[model samples]
Target chain A: SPGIWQLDCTHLEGKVILVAVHVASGYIEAEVIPAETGQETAYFLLKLAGRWPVKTVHTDNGSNFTSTTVKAACDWAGIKQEDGIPYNPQSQGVIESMNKELKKIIGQVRDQAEHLKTAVQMAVFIHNHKRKGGIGGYSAGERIVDIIATD
Target chain B: SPGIWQLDCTHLEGKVILVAVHVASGYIEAEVIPAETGQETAYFLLKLAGRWPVKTVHTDNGSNFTSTTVKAACDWAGIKQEDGGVIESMNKELKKIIGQVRDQAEHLKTAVQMAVFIHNHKRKGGIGGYSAGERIVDIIATDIQ
Candidate 1:
């Protein structure tokens, strides 16, 4: 809703996950990637642009995030890149909390589901539906719709 | 219950938490330590030994876990130490669970204690449908006796 999104990547079972959360709405977008290379990250950012109106993308100082390809992709999308300080979790608080939720949900999903990709897909869906505090008591899925409607 | 255990540490709000889970029974013991130093880690290990019969402890290659003080404590308790994996996912879940507790209680130690209790009693499908507390009933009774 605020047009500022936090983006990051986490690993599970040797695969990479690209995650983005809208700062104001708590709306999240996540996808499974084979690796966290510049190309994969760039593609994720580009796809993310198609789904929502992204003005700024914030991330930690990971090499892939700062890579030329990712920078080029952001430039192509007209998205500003903001990097958090190295080794400081406070700077990327939103995405860090989101990563924990993603990890916990994926672990829960694995108890019944075997596929890593499918588990992540299910986790993303579950997360968007779960009501959280601070978002006007609306779930991220519901809040995102409200934001887009007024725009 | 089997004597093998998995031990690991995770950080929260600049604090270290020592966690141990019995491999067979799934019983869990967790404590919040101020730091992850050898002294703190060894003290937690010795305390864990007093609570449970530990034959072997599997841990990742963290320097604190492999320190001489921790090794000496393990040796004194007659517990063998080994190295390993997969407890990482457990740590992830623990961190998330405790994060919730902290939000509610606003105290770190109390949050950890509450989180450990919830984790031990939670119905886990991986452990033959037995909660860790349920699986460790005999051990608990034996220790009490």
Candidate 2:
């Protein structure tokens, strides 16, 4: 009943990473935040504007999402931003669920910090590309990208 | 699960927050990770050391629990640390909550504290009419809150 979205930042090992997730596709993109603020947040979302056909963006009460810079960036991207309730983070339950599964693999090993970003990227790739019984068993990547991924 | 606990942090808006859960009582404590490292994880646990009488501490499969600093500090705090994953499973709703309730950093911190408070005060399925807080602070354990 709504546009696709749910964006926020979380820690992987010791680094802060921002995440954007699509509702219907379950496709994901994550990037490390060098300095966590509206600047980095805006830049992260803006850069992805070209990748995803984002009509509306949803976030929690993060300063990064509401700051002037982020507002202008959202405006330029022509993206609508929505805020969830205070202390009720379940609005983006999908992303949280994603992190739960990813954390097990990403934070399990010792050198994981080193492999963190690469690990998550590959995880997302596999997540979308892998096929299961549901959704006609079509690969999520295939369903979302509408193109077969090979090599 | 008399957990000293290895808390899995969940994101609240843009910040990462850690949570500690006591098994028998289900009392919880949460704090934001000022620094995303083993030190902060250790400190977050250590600060709670005096709050709960943990016979043996159990935690998630995070290397954050293996730092020489944490085990060494655990010895100083007089509690044995063991690796475990019960809390992670218990934290799914928490992550979802963080996603739903977004706020400023300081306000987010307050929101997290409120979560910890409410978790303690709320009754659980198994705990016969008592909030985790009452069980921990009054009957079974010390006044940790």
Candidate 3:
């Protein structure tokens, strides 16, 4: 199975959220934690993907991904972990676009709490079946295959 | 004769407007035109500050401000121009908060417009001022000083 994840540190209250997205199918899992420390992130990784047969995972070189725990987990799972450059986002365009599109769709909802949950669900649904083409005209599912096959 | 000018760029059709605000005294004036070209900005600067004895004008380093025409006009007007790094930083913070609100609203343009209004008119300041509007009035009355 293919999996995707995003580490967002842009919070005012100093909280961080790790969002795991299944690229080929658009399935998503999110965890709001107190910090984005390596240990915290490694725990999230284990919880979200540890049981699943994850062959490859793509992420940015955030401290979490570079941590010993996360690398060890990937090694144990035999998962090929791919990391993009520090600030360049092109490598992870599918998730980035999904983030923007999800926001645009959810932003229309009046009840923000309800909207956020619905948007995440809807984003996964749309990504898997919508056959939408963005950036390089690859669907999210297609991108996942390409990442796993090439990397 | 200081006053506050509420600028509406919605009708300007993608044109950039130069807004000048007095720092100590919160007087505001906005100049709208087809572009942020130096000549147009210089004209607006002269019209807004030349008629009055402006001690200082604060603005960001938009193309309008960096233009030769605006530079010459400011020099001729003998008005001190203050570039605000702190104010720009505040704008970035506001964007992050407002961007979330806009995403939830699903109407980016409307959300941004309403957010600007809230920031300028409804939001309170550090002092007893009700909003930027109130601060501007207090500054005009010399109560802020």
Candidate 4:
């Protein structure tokens, strides 16, 4: 019974935002990357693992995630890499929807801050703290401890 | 043919925000006011008129907009004030976007300024894929070009 995580990357203001969502708790981890290259994608996976237990990563057939660099990192971390239903939103809706909304907030934040990295940081913090619908009225950050402790 | 502008007010962090949107251009003007009063609303309307020609003002039944104080300002300025519709939708949208960054009243002035700037500059579908503020720029640029 591993924690299932959905992963995706969205572009904003000439930067790539690598996003990961914990399917159970709706917890999100996102960072701004210079490009959607395999190296940065692999680094994002490793960073996510450092924050929370990432046993499985489900992503599209994008080159960044399918590259040998990411596969090697996943293998070294004992994580199962999954390519689930290519180009299908139903299977990857969690991270897909998050990416769409994240772009909107990123635009608003970036408009004020005029910096891509700082905007993504602020946008990610706001998303994690805001309460999600299906999680019994608790925010993603609030659910993280209970999810990790209990499950 | 004078452009009709909609006026409204909303509260955040114990501060009142006065808002006006030009119907034709979709251009927006917003400022955080000290309080939501007829005098203040009237003053804001004058300020808005000063920036752009305000021939008619459409507003809700809020006391701030309906009171005689605002009416007198409208009369002196030769502007017609009509009442209908609520700007609560825009208010909620403002909060939904701005609420994330600005938590204190002190931050609201700059927050509202940024918010208004973004709205006018953003290309909207309802306005034929042109930004709200693009109409003015297009006019000025066309004459020079």
**Residue A78 CA error for candidate 2 (Å)?**
0.5
| Per-residue lDDT over A31-141 for candidate 3, one digit per residue giving the tens place of the 0 to 100 score | 355667765665556444422235567776766788886787566445678876222234434344444554454344324223233333333333433344554454443
The reply for model 4, stretches above 4 Å from the true place, is A85-96, A133-136, B1-145
lDDT of candidate 3 over B1-145, digit per residue (tens): 2422211222222544344444443333443346656665655555444222355556655665667655766665565665634344434433554555555333333333334434445445465545554454344334212
Per-residue CA lDDT of model 2 for A1-151, tens digit only, reads 2235678777866788787766555556665667778867876675455334467877866767778878876776678888673222233223347666555645443242234554554344445445655655654433433321110
Q: State the lDDT of candidate 1 residue by residue for A1-151, as single tens digits.
A: 3577888888888888888887765667676777779877876776566334578888876789989978976875678999883222232223347888888988876664445665665566667667666555656655554444321
> DockQ of all candidates, in order?
0.01, 0.01, 0.01, 0.01
- For residues B1-145, could you state the per-residue lDDT of candidate 4 as single tens digits? 2257778887877888887766665566677777888876876665454334467888876788878767765765567887743355667766665665454223566566545555665667774576656653343224223
Query: Model 1 shows how many backbone clashes?
Result: 0
DockQ, structure candidate 1:
0.01
Q: Which prediction has more favorable TM-score, 2 or 4? A: 4
Q: TM-scores across all candidates?
A: 0.46, 0.43, 0.34, 0.46
Q: Which pairs clash in model 3?
A: A107-B103, A107-B104, A107-B105, A107-B106, A108-B106
Residue-wise lDDT of candidate 4 within A1-151, one digit each (tens)?
Answer: 3267888887775677788877765667777777788877876675455334568888866778888878876875568998763322332123346787777776765664435665565566556656656555656655544455321
Candidate 1 wrongly placed segments (more than 4 Å): A85-96, A133-136, B1-145
User: What is the iRMSD of the candidate numbered 1?
Assistant: 23.5
Greater-TM-score candidate between 3 and 4: 4
